[PDB]
Design a protein around this ligand. Structure first.
Ligand SMILES: Nc1ncnc2c1ncn2[C@@H]1O[C@@H]2COP(=O)(O)O[C@H]2[C@H]1O
Ligand SMILES: Nc1ncnc2c1ncn2[C@@H]1O[C@@H]2COP(=O)(O)O[C@H]2[C@H]1O
Ligand SMILES: Nc1ncnc2c1ncn2[C@@H]1O[C@@H]2COP(=O)(O)O[C@H]2[C@H]1O
Ligand SMILES: Nc1ncnc2c1ncn2[C@@H]1O[C@@H]2COP(=O)(O)O[C@H]2[C@H]1O
Lengths: 200, 200
DNA sequence: AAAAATGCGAT
DNA sequence: CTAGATCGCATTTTT
DNA sequence: AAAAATGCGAT
DNA sequence: CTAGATCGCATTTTT
Protein backbone atom coordinates (compact mmCIF):
# COMPACT_ATOMS: atom_id res chain seq x y z
CA UNK A 1 0.00 0.00 0.00
CA UNK A 2 1.03 3.65 -0.48
CA UNK A 3 1.13 4.79 3.16
CA UNK A 4 3.59 1.96 3.81
CA UNK A 5 6.65 3.11 1.85
CA UNK A 6 5.91 6.44 3.48
CA UNK A 7 5.91 5.15 7.05
CA UNK A 8 8.83 2.87 6.24
CA UNK A 9 10.71 5.79 4.73
CA UNK A 10 10.82 7.37 8.24
CA UNK A 11 12.17 4.38 10.09
CA UNK A 12 15.56 3.02 11.06
CA UNK A 13 15.86 -0.45 9.57
CA UNK A 14 17.63 -2.89 11.89
CA UNK A 15 18.56 -6.52 11.65
CA UNK A 16 18.45 -9.11 14.40
CA UNK A 17 19.87 -12.60 14.05
CA UNK A 18 17.74 -15.52 15.11
CA UNK A 19 17.60 -16.29 18.83
CA UNK A 20 18.28 -12.63 19.71
CA UNK A 21 16.40 -10.03 21.81
CA UNK A 22 14.65 -7.06 20.28
CA UNK A 23 12.69 -6.01 23.36
CA UNK A 24 13.38 -6.55 27.06
CA UNK A 25 10.65 -6.81 29.64
CA UNK A 26 10.44 -3.92 32.09
CA UNK A 27 12.54 -1.39 30.24
CA UNK A 28 11.44 2.11 29.33
CA UNK A 29 9.51 1.94 26.08
CA UNK A 30 10.14 4.77 23.58
CA UNK A 31 10.39 2.92 20.29
CA UNK A 32 7.96 1.26 17.91
CA UNK A 33 8.82 -1.74 15.75
CA UNK A 34 7.47 -3.08 12.50
CA UNK A 35 8.56 -6.45 11.27
CA UNK A 36 9.64 -5.98 7.67
CA UNK A 37 10.84 -9.57 7.37
CA UNK A 38 11.26 -12.53 9.75
CA UNK A 39 9.46 -14.04 12.76
CA UNK A 40 9.69 -13.23 16.45
CA UNK A 41 8.26 -14.62 19.67
CA UNK A 42 6.63 -12.66 22.47
CA UNK A 43 7.28 -14.24 25.84
CA UNK A 44 6.68 -13.60 29.57
CA UNK A 45 8.40 -15.28 32.54
CA UNK A 46 7.89 -16.63 36.03
CA UNK A 47 10.33 -15.85 38.85
CA UNK A 48 12.17 -19.10 38.10
CA UNK A 49 12.70 -18.37 34.42
CA UNK A 50 10.11 -20.63 32.86
CA UNK A 51 8.91 -18.85 29.70
CA UNK A 52 5.43 -18.53 28.29
CA UNK A 53 4.96 -17.59 24.64
CA UNK A 54 1.97 -15.27 24.23
CA UNK A 55 2.33 -14.95 20.53
CA UNK A 56 4.52 -15.23 17.49
CA UNK A 57 4.71 -12.21 15.13
CA UNK A 58 5.57 -11.86 11.46
CA UNK A 59 6.08 -9.61 8.53
CA UNK A 60 3.61 -6.83 8.66
CA UNK A 61 3.38 -6.81 12.45
CA UNK A 62 4.09 -3.90 14.77
CA UNK A 63 5.95 -4.63 18.05
CA UNK A 64 6.38 -2.45 21.11
CA UNK A 65 3.13 -0.57 20.48
CA UNK A 66 1.75 -1.04 23.97
CA UNK A 67 3.96 1.56 25.60
CA UNK A 68 2.95 4.14 23.04
CA UNK A 69 -0.13 5.50 24.77
CA UNK A 70 0.70 6.37 28.35
CA UNK A 71 3.77 8.32 29.44
CA UNK A 72 6.62 6.43 31.07
CA UNK A 73 5.52 2.94 30.24
CA UNK A 74 7.60 -0.25 30.41
CA UNK A 75 7.93 -3.11 27.95
CA UNK A 76 5.40 -5.76 28.92
CA UNK A 77 7.28 -8.75 27.66
CA UNK A 78 10.41 -10.08 26.10
CA UNK A 79 10.39 -10.23 22.29
CA UNK A 80 12.94 -12.64 20.80
CA UNK A 81 13.75 -13.52 17.18
CA UNK A 82 12.67 -16.89 15.81
CA UNK A 83 14.53 -16.35 12.63
CA UNK A 84 16.74 -13.66 11.23
CA UNK A 85 14.88 -10.35 11.18
CA UNK A 86 14.61 -7.02 9.44
CA UNK A 87 12.66 -4.70 11.69
CA UNK A 88 11.78 -1.12 10.93
CA UNK A 89 12.16 0.94 14.06
CA UNK A 90 10.91 4.42 14.86
CA UNK A 91 10.70 6.77 17.83
CA UNK A 92 7.34 7.04 19.58
CA UNK A 93 7.89 10.82 19.51
CA UNK A 94 8.37 10.50 15.79
CA UNK A 95 5.50 8.04 15.19
CA UNK A 96 3.06 10.28 17.08
CA UNK A 97 3.90 12.91 14.48
CA UNK A 98 3.32 10.61 11.48
CA UNK A 99 -0.20 9.72 12.62
CA UNK A 100 -1.14 13.40 12.78
CA UNK A 101 -0.18 13.86 9.17
CA UNK A 102 -2.00 10.57 8.70
CA UNK A 103 -4.08 8.95 11.50
CA UNK A 104 -4.84 6.20 9.05
CA UNK A 105 -1.63 4.46 10.02
CA UNK A 106 -2.75 4.68 13.65
CA UNK A 107 -5.83 2.77 12.48
CA UNK A 108 -3.71 0.01 10.98
CA UNK A 109 -2.05 -0.41 14.37
CA UNK A 110 -5.21 -0.37 16.47
CA UNK A 111 -6.59 -3.09 14.22
CA UNK A 112 -3.62 -5.31 15.05
CA UNK A 113 -4.11 -4.62 18.71
CA UNK A 114 -7.73 -5.66 18.28
CA UNK A 115 -6.78 -8.91 16.62
CA UNK A 116 -4.12 -9.48 19.29
CA UNK A 117 -6.62 -8.97 22.08
CA UNK A 118 -8.98 -11.38 20.38
CA UNK A 119 -6.50 -14.20 20.24
CA UNK A 120 -5.05 -13.61 23.72
CA UNK A 121 -8.55 -13.84 25.07
CA UNK A 122 -9.05 -16.91 22.96
CA UNK A 123 -5.85 -18.12 24.57
CA UNK A 124 -7.29 -17.41 28.04
CA UNK A 125 -10.31 -19.60 27.51
CA UNK A 126 -7.98 -22.29 26.20
CA UNK A 127 -5.94 -22.44 29.39
CA UNK A 128 -9.17 -22.33 31.34
CA UNK A 129 -11.25 -24.74 29.36
CA UNK A 130 -8.93 -27.23 27.67
CA UNK A 131 -6.64 -29.88 29.14
CA UNK A 132 -3.03 -30.11 27.91
CA UNK A 133 -3.83 -32.78 25.33
CA UNK A 134 -6.47 -30.52 23.75
CA UNK A 135 -4.16 -27.53 23.82
CA UNK A 136 -1.31 -29.44 22.26
CA UNK A 137 -3.75 -30.87 19.69
CA UNK A 138 -5.07 -27.43 18.74
CA UNK A 139 -1.45 -26.26 18.46
CA UNK A 140 -0.09 -28.95 16.12
CA UNK A 141 -3.20 -28.22 14.07
CA UNK A 142 -2.47 -24.48 13.92
CA UNK A 143 1.20 -25.11 13.38
CA UNK A 144 0.42 -27.39 10.44
CA UNK A 145 -1.86 -24.84 8.78
CA UNK A 146 1.04 -22.38 8.87
CA UNK A 147 2.76 -21.43 5.59
CA UNK A 148 6.16 -22.50 6.88
CA UNK A 149 4.78 -25.99 7.39
CA UNK A 150 6.31 -28.67 5.15
CA UNK A 151 4.06 -30.64 2.84
CA UNK A 152 4.32 -34.40 3.40
CA UNK A 153 2.69 -37.52 1.82
CA UNK A 154 0.63 -38.38 4.88
CA UNK A 155 -0.29 -34.86 5.94
CA UNK A 156 1.67 -31.79 7.06
CA UNK A 157 5.17 -31.74 8.57
CA UNK A 158 6.31 -29.25 11.24
CA UNK A 159 9.55 -28.86 13.24
CA UNK A 160 9.58 -27.85 16.91
CA UNK A 161 10.72 -29.09 20.29
CA UNK A 162 8.63 -30.64 23.04
CA UNK A 163 10.13 -27.87 25.15
CA UNK A 164 8.63 -25.07 23.03
CA UNK A 165 5.22 -26.67 22.61
CA UNK A 166 5.34 -26.61 26.35
CA UNK A 167 5.97 -22.88 26.44
CA UNK A 168 3.04 -22.52 24.13
CA UNK A 169 0.39 -24.69 25.81
CA UNK A 170 1.81 -23.90 29.23
CA UNK A 171 2.92 -27.33 30.51
CA UNK A 172 6.09 -29.28 31.25
CA UNK A 173 8.20 -30.53 28.38
CA UNK A 174 7.77 -33.95 30.00
CA UNK A 175 4.00 -33.68 29.67
CA UNK A 176 4.34 -32.72 26.03
CA UNK A 177 6.59 -35.67 25.21
CA UNK A 178 4.07 -38.04 26.80
CA UNK A 179 0.99 -36.56 25.15
CA UNK A 180 2.95 -36.69 21.93
CA UNK A 181 3.58 -40.43 22.34
CA UNK A 182 -0.14 -40.90 22.99
CA UNK A 183 -1.12 -38.96 19.90
CA UNK A 184 1.15 -41.22 17.93
CA UNK A 185 -0.09 -44.21 19.92
CA UNK A 186 -3.42 -43.18 18.44
CA UNK A 187 -2.04 -42.79 14.88
CA UNK A 188 -2.77 -39.06 14.85
CA UNK A 189 0.79 -37.93 14.44
CA UNK A 190 4.22 -39.38 13.97
CA UNK A 191 7.10 -37.72 15.79
CA UNK A 192 10.81 -38.38 15.33
CA UNK A 193 12.93 -35.73 17.02
CA UNK A 194 11.85 -32.12 16.37
CA UNK A 195 9.99 -33.45 13.36
CA UNK A 196 6.30 -34.17 13.71
CA UNK A 197 4.03 -35.29 10.99
CA UNK A 198 0.43 -34.31 11.79
CA UNK A 199 -1.52 -36.82 9.74
CA UNK A 200 -4.37 -35.63 7.58
CA UNK B 1 -12.37 16.69 28.89
CA UNK B 2 -13.71 18.73 25.95
CA UNK B 3 -13.72 16.04 23.24
CA UNK B 4 -15.91 13.96 25.54
CA UNK B 5 -19.15 15.98 25.59
CA UNK B 6 -18.60 16.16 21.86
CA UNK B 7 -18.32 12.40 21.31
CA UNK B 8 -21.09 11.82 23.84
CA UNK B 9 -23.26 14.37 22.07
CA UNK B 10 -23.33 12.01 19.04
CA UNK B 11 -24.35 8.87 20.86
CA UNK B 12 -27.57 7.11 21.77
CA UNK B 13 -27.67 6.78 25.54
CA UNK B 14 -29.12 3.46 26.68
CA UNK B 15 -29.77 1.91 30.04
CA UNK B 16 -29.33 -1.72 31.02
CA UNK B 17 -30.48 -3.14 34.32
CA UNK B 18 -28.07 -5.27 36.30
CA UNK B 19 -27.69 -8.90 35.22
CA UNK B 20 -28.62 -8.02 31.61
CA UNK B 21 -26.85 -8.51 28.24
CA UNK B 22 -25.42 -5.64 26.26
CA UNK B 23 -23.41 -7.70 23.80
CA UNK B 24 -23.87 -11.27 22.56
CA UNK B 25 -21.01 -13.45 21.45
CA UNK B 26 -20.92 -14.25 17.73
CA UNK B 27 -23.30 -11.60 16.48
CA UNK B 28 -22.52 -9.08 13.77
CA UNK B 29 -20.75 -6.14 15.36
CA UNK B 30 -21.72 -2.67 14.07
CA UNK B 31 -21.97 -0.66 17.27
CA UNK B 32 -19.53 0.86 19.73
CA UNK B 33 -20.26 1.30 23.43
CA UNK B 34 -18.96 3.64 26.07
CA UNK B 35 -19.84 3.07 29.68
CA UNK B 36 -21.12 6.37 31.00
CA UNK B 37 -22.04 4.87 34.37
CA UNK B 38 -22.12 1.36 35.87
CA UNK B 39 -20.06 -1.85 35.70
CA UNK B 40 -20.17 -4.75 33.26
CA UNK B 41 -18.49 -8.12 32.90
CA UNK B 42 -16.89 -9.54 29.78
CA UNK B 43 -17.25 -13.30 29.62
CA UNK B 44 -16.53 -16.23 27.27
CA UNK B 45 -17.96 -19.78 27.43
CA UNK B 46 -17.18 -23.44 26.96
CA UNK B 47 -19.54 -25.76 25.06
CA UNK B 48 -21.14 -26.76 28.36
CA UNK B 49 -21.91 -23.21 29.48
CA UNK B 50 -19.22 -22.69 32.08
CA UNK B 51 -18.32 -18.98 31.94
CA UNK B 52 -14.95 -17.31 32.16
CA UNK B 53 -14.73 -13.62 33.03
CA UNK B 54 -11.96 -11.93 31.03
CA UNK B 55 -12.52 -8.56 32.50
CA UNK B 56 -14.82 -6.19 34.29
CA UNK B 57 -15.36 -2.71 32.75
CA UNK B 58 -16.42 0.62 34.21
CA UNK B 59 -17.25 4.20 33.63
CA UNK B 60 -15.01 5.58 31.00
CA UNK B 61 -14.60 2.27 29.19
CA UNK B 62 -15.43 1.53 25.57
CA UNK B 63 -17.06 -1.85 24.76
CA UNK B 64 -17.51 -3.57 21.42
CA UNK B 65 -14.46 -1.87 19.90
CA UNK B 66 -12.88 -5.06 18.60
CA UNK B 67 -15.21 -5.46 15.66
CA UNK B 68 -14.53 -1.91 14.54
CA UNK B 69 -11.49 -2.56 12.38
CA UNK B 70 -12.21 -5.37 9.97
CA UNK B 71 -15.37 -5.67 7.88
CA UNK B 72 -17.98 -8.22 8.92
CA UNK B 73 -16.65 -9.02 12.33
CA UNK B 74 -18.46 -10.83 15.16
CA UNK B 75 -18.68 -10.02 18.85
CA UNK B 76 -15.90 -11.90 20.61
CA UNK B 77 -17.60 -12.34 23.93
CA UNK B 78 -20.68 -11.84 25.98
CA UNK B 79 -20.83 -8.55 27.91
CA UNK B 80 -23.26 -8.56 30.85
CA UNK B 81 -24.16 -5.85 33.37
CA UNK B 82 -22.88 -6.13 36.93
CA UNK B 83 -24.93 -3.22 38.04
CA UNK B 84 -27.41 -0.91 36.44
CA UNK B 85 -25.82 0.83 33.46
CA UNK B 86 -25.90 3.93 31.32
CA UNK B 87 -24.04 3.19 28.13
CA UNK B 88 -23.48 5.60 25.30
CA UNK B 89 -23.87 3.77 22.03
CA UNK B 90 -22.87 4.78 18.52
CA UNK B 91 -22.71 3.28 15.04
CA UNK B 92 -19.30 2.14 13.83
CA UNK B 93 -20.15 3.92 10.55
CA UNK B 94 -20.78 7.01 12.60
CA UNK B 95 -17.75 6.62 14.92
CA UNK B 96 -15.42 6.19 11.94
CA UNK B 97 -16.59 9.64 10.88
CA UNK B 98 -15.97 11.26 14.30
CA UNK B 99 -12.33 10.12 14.37
CA UNK B 100 -11.69 11.77 11.01
CA UNK B 101 -12.85 15.08 12.35
CA UNK B 102 -10.80 14.11 15.39
CA UNK B 103 -8.47 11.05 15.40
CA UNK B 104 -7.60 11.99 18.93
CA UNK B 105 -10.62 10.07 20.17
CA UNK B 106 -9.35 7.06 18.21
CA UNK B 107 -6.19 7.44 20.29
CA UNK B 108 -8.15 7.31 23.53
CA UNK B 109 -9.61 3.99 22.38
CA UNK B 110 -6.36 2.42 21.22
CA UNK B 111 -4.88 3.24 24.60
CA UNK B 112 -7.62 1.24 26.31
CA UNK B 113 -7.02 -1.63 23.96
CA UNK B 114 -3.34 -1.44 24.90
CA UNK B 115 -4.11 -1.58 28.60
CA UNK B 116 -6.59 -4.40 27.96
CA UNK B 117 -4.01 -6.42 26.08
CA UNK B 118 -1.54 -5.87 28.90
CA UNK B 119 -3.80 -7.25 31.57
CA UNK B 120 -5.12 -10.16 29.47
CA UNK B 121 -1.56 -11.18 28.87
CA UNK B 122 -0.91 -10.71 32.55
CA UNK B 123 -3.93 -12.94 33.01
CA UNK B 124 -2.39 -15.56 30.68
CA UNK B 125 0.78 -15.87 32.72
CA UNK B 126 -1.40 -16.16 35.82
CA UNK B 127 -3.26 -19.20 34.54
CA UNK B 128 0.04 -20.61 33.37
CA UNK B 129 2.20 -19.82 36.32
CA UNK B 130 0.01 -19.68 39.43
CA UNK B 131 -1.99 -22.40 41.17
CA UNK B 132 -5.62 -21.70 42.13
CA UNK B 133 -4.73 -20.61 45.66
CA UNK B 134 -2.37 -17.96 44.29
CA UNK B 135 -4.90 -16.80 41.73
CA UNK B 136 -7.65 -16.56 44.28
CA UNK B 137 -5.24 -14.76 46.64
CA UNK B 138 -4.24 -12.21 43.99
CA UNK B 139 -7.95 -11.71 43.26
CA UNK B 140 -9.20 -11.01 46.80
CA UNK B 141 -6.26 -8.61 46.98
CA UNK B 142 -7.30 -6.80 43.78
CA UNK B 143 -10.92 -6.91 44.78
CA UNK B 144 -10.11 -5.32 48.12
CA UNK B 145 -8.12 -2.49 46.56
CA UNK B 146 -11.20 -1.65 44.48
CA UNK B 147 -13.14 1.55 45.27
CA UNK B 148 -16.38 -0.36 45.77
CA UNK B 149 -14.70 -2.33 48.54
CA UNK B 150 -16.13 -1.73 52.03
CA UNK B 151 -13.84 -0.43 54.74
CA UNK B 152 -13.77 -2.70 57.81
CA UNK B 153 -11.98 -2.63 61.22
CA UNK B 154 -9.70 -5.56 60.44
CA UNK B 155 -9.02 -4.79 56.79
CA UNK B 156 -11.16 -4.50 53.66
CA UNK B 157 -14.58 -6.08 53.06
CA UNK B 158 -15.78 -7.36 49.67
CA UNK B 159 -18.94 -9.20 48.53
CA UNK B 160 -18.88 -11.97 45.92
CA UNK B 161 -19.76 -15.61 45.48
CA UNK B 162 -17.42 -18.59 45.45
CA UNK B 163 -19.03 -19.27 42.09
CA UNK B 164 -17.87 -15.98 40.54
CA UNK B 165 -14.36 -16.08 41.99
CA UNK B 166 -14.31 -19.37 40.19
CA UNK B 167 -15.22 -17.75 36.89
CA UNK B 168 -12.44 -15.32 37.51
CA UNK B 169 -9.56 -17.60 38.51
CA UNK B 170 -10.87 -20.36 36.28
CA UNK B 171 -11.64 -23.17 38.74
CA UNK B 172 -14.61 -24.98 40.26
CA UNK B 173 -16.75 -23.21 42.82
CA UNK B 174 -15.97 -26.20 45.04
CA UNK B 175 -12.26 -25.48 44.79
CA UNK B 176 -12.85 -21.86 45.67
CA UNK B 177 -14.88 -22.69 48.76
CA UNK B 178 -12.11 -24.99 49.98
CA UNK B 179 -9.24 -22.60 49.31
CA UNK B 180 -11.34 -19.98 51.03
CA UNK B 181 -11.65 -22.14 54.16
CA UNK B 182 -7.88 -22.63 54.09
CA UNK B 183 -7.20 -18.93 53.79
CA UNK B 184 -9.38 -18.42 56.82
CA UNK B 185 -7.80 -21.48 58.46
CA UNK B 186 -4.64 -19.43 58.08
CA UNK B 187 -6.22 -16.22 59.49
CA UNK B 188 -5.79 -14.40 56.18
CA UNK B 189 -9.44 -13.79 55.55
CA UNK B 190 -12.76 -14.33 57.21
CA UNK B 191 -15.68 -15.38 55.03
CA UNK B 192 -19.34 -15.59 56.00
CA UNK B 193 -21.59 -16.00 52.97
CA UNK B 194 -20.83 -13.66 50.05
CA UNK B 195 -19.01 -11.48 52.55
CA UNK B 196 -15.27 -11.84 52.84
CA UNK B 197 -13.04 -9.78 55.00
CA UNK B 198 -9.50 -9.74 53.58
CA UNK B 199 -7.46 -8.95 56.67
CA UNK B 200 -4.82 -6.26 56.51
C1' DA C 1 32.72 -31.59 18.23
C1' DA C 2 29.50 -29.06 21.55
C1' DA C 3 24.98 -27.20 22.88
C1' DA C 4 20.02 -28.37 23.35
C1' DA C 5 16.67 -31.26 23.97
C1' DT C 6 14.82 -35.74 26.13
C1' DG C 7 13.23 -39.22 28.99
C1' DC C 8 13.37 -41.80 33.41
C1' DG C 9 8.90 -43.20 36.21
C1' DA C 10 8.08 -43.65 40.54
C1' DT C 11 6.43 -39.74 43.60
C1' DC D 1 -9.55 -40.79 40.41
C1' DT D 2 -7.63 -38.21 36.65
C1' DA D 3 -4.24 -35.06 34.95
C1' DG D 4 0.33 -33.02 35.65
C1' DA D 5 5.09 -31.41 37.88
C1' DT D 6 9.26 -33.30 39.72
C1' DC D 7 14.49 -34.54 39.51
C1' DG D 8 19.70 -34.97 38.19
C1' DC D 9 21.95 -36.91 34.24
C1' DA D 10 23.12 -39.98 30.83
C1' DT D 11 21.52 -40.90 26.04
C1' DT D 12 19.94 -39.18 21.95
C1' DT D 13 18.96 -35.40 18.53
C1' DT D 14 20.47 -30.82 16.50
C1' DT D 15 23.18 -26.94 15.19
C1' DA E 1 -41.56 -16.71 49.70
C1' DA E 2 -38.40 -18.20 45.75
C1' DA E 3 -33.98 -18.15 43.27
C1' DA E 4 -28.93 -18.71 43.85
C1' DA E 5 -25.34 -20.34 45.94
C1' DT E 6 -23.04 -24.18 48.79
C1' DG E 7 -21.03 -28.20 50.43
C1' DC E 8 -20.76 -33.31 50.63
C1' DG E 9 -16.06 -36.07 50.33
C1' DA E 10 -15.00 -40.03 48.65
C1' DT E 11 -13.53 -40.77 43.68
C1' DC F 1 2.32 -37.18 45.35
C1' DT F 2 0.02 -32.81 44.94
C1' DA F 3 -3.69 -30.12 43.12
C1' DG F 4 -8.36 -30.15 41.21
C1' DA F 5 -13.12 -31.74 38.97
C1' DT F 6 -17.04 -34.57 39.98
C1' DC F 7 -22.16 -35.38 41.41
C1' DG F 8 -27.37 -34.83 42.66
C1' DC F 9 -29.65 -32.44 46.33
C1' DA F 10 -30.73 -30.96 50.70
C1' DT F 11 -29.29 -27.04 53.69
C1' DT F 12 -28.05 -22.51 54.03
C1' DT F 13 -27.54 -17.66 52.26
C1' DT F 14 -29.51 -13.85 49.25
C1' DT F 15 -32.57 -11.10 46.58
N1 LIG G 1 2.36 -23.92 34.25
C1 LIG G 1 3.57 -24.20 33.75
N2 LIG G 1 4.26 -25.24 34.29
C2 LIG G 1 5.47 -25.52 33.81
N3 LIG G 1 6.15 -24.91 32.82
C3 LIG G 1 5.44 -23.90 32.30
C4 LIG G 1 4.18 -23.49 32.68
N4 LIG G 1 3.75 -22.43 31.90
C5 LIG G 1 4.75 -22.23 31.07
N5 LIG G 1 5.80 -23.08 31.26
C6 LIG G 1 7.06 -23.12 30.51
O1 LIG G 1 6.91 -24.05 29.42
C7 LIG G 1 8.03 -24.97 29.44
C8 LIG G 1 7.74 -26.33 28.89
O2 LIG G 1 8.92 -27.13 29.01
P1 LIG G 1 9.87 -27.08 30.32
O3 LIG G 1 9.38 -28.08 31.33
O4 LIG G 1 11.30 -27.11 29.85
O5 LIG G 1 9.64 -25.62 30.97
C9 LIG G 1 8.36 -25.05 30.91
C10 LIG G 1 8.30 -23.59 31.31
O6 LIG G 1 9.49 -22.95 30.87
N1 LIG H 1 -0.52 -10.81 24.36
C1 LIG H 1 0.23 -10.33 23.38
N2 LIG H 1 0.01 -10.75 22.11
C2 LIG H 1 0.80 -10.28 21.13
N3 LIG H 1 1.81 -9.42 21.20
C3 LIG H 1 2.00 -9.01 22.47
C4 LIG H 1 1.27 -9.40 23.58
N4 LIG H 1 1.76 -8.78 24.73
C5 LIG H 1 2.75 -8.05 24.29
N5 LIG H 1 2.95 -8.13 22.93
C6 LIG H 1 3.93 -7.40 22.13
O1 LIG H 1 5.20 -7.47 22.78
C7 LIG H 1 5.64 -6.12 23.07
C8 LIG H 1 6.48 -6.01 24.31
O2 LIG H 1 6.75 -4.62 24.56
P1 LIG H 1 5.61 -3.49 24.51
O3 LIG H 1 4.88 -3.46 25.82
O4 LIG H 1 6.20 -2.25 24.00
O5 LIG H 1 4.60 -4.01 23.36
C9 LIG H 1 4.33 -5.40 23.26
C10 LIG H 1 3.57 -5.91 22.05
O6 LIG H 1 4.05 -5.37 20.83
N1 LIG I 1 -11.17 -24.83 33.95
C1 LIG I 1 -12.38 -24.62 34.50
N2 LIG I 1 -12.96 -25.63 35.19
C2 LIG I 1 -14.17 -25.43 35.72
N3 LIG I 1 -14.94 -24.34 35.68
C3 LIG I 1 -14.33 -23.35 35.00
C4 LIG I 1 -13.10 -23.39 34.40
N4 LIG I 1 -12.80 -22.17 33.81
C5 LIG I 1 -13.84 -21.43 34.07
N5 LIG I 1 -14.81 -22.08 34.79
C6 LIG I 1 -16.10 -21.54 35.24
O1 LIG I 1 -15.92 -21.00 36.55
C7 LIG I 1 -16.97 -21.54 37.41
C8 LIG I 1 -16.60 -21.66 38.85
O2 LIG I 1 -17.71 -22.24 39.57
P1 LIG I 1 -18.59 -23.44 38.95
O3 LIG I 1 -17.98 -24.76 39.32
O4 LIG I 1 -20.03 -23.16 39.26
O5 LIG I 1 -18.44 -23.32 37.34
C9 LIG I 1 -17.22 -22.90 36.81
C10 LIG I 1 -17.25 -22.56 35.33
O6 LIG I 1 -18.52 -21.97 35.02
N1 LIG J 1 -9.82 -9.77 26.93
C1 LIG J 1 -10.66 -8.74 26.99
N2 LIG J 1 -10.46 -7.81 27.95
C2 LIG J 1 -11.33 -6.79 28.04
N3 LIG J 1 -12.41 -6.53 27.29
C3 LIG J 1 -12.57 -7.47 26.34
C4 LIG J 1 -11.76 -8.57 26.13
N4 LIG J 1 -12.24 -9.33 25.07
C5 LIG J 1 -13.30 -8.69 24.68
N5 LIG J 1 -13.56 -7.54 25.39
C6 LIG J 1 -14.63 -6.57 25.18
O1 LIG J 1 -15.86 -7.28 25.00
C7 LIG J 1 -16.39 -6.94 23.69
C8 LIG J 1 -17.17 -8.05 23.05
O2 LIG J 1 -17.55 -7.64 21.72
P1 LIG J 1 -16.50 -6.99 20.70
O3 LIG J 1 -15.72 -8.07 20.02
O4 LIG J 1 -17.22 -6.00 19.88
O5 LIG J 1 -15.52 -6.13 21.65
C9 LIG J 1 -15.13 -6.67 22.90
C10 LIG J 1 -14.40 -5.78 23.89
O6 LIG J 1 -14.97 -4.50 24.01
Amino acid sequence: DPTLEWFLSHCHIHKYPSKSTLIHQGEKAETLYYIVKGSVAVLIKDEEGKEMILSYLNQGDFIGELGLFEEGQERSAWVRAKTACEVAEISYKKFRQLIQVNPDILMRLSAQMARRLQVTSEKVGNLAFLDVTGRIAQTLLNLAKQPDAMTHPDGMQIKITRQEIGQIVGCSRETVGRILKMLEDQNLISAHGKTIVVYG
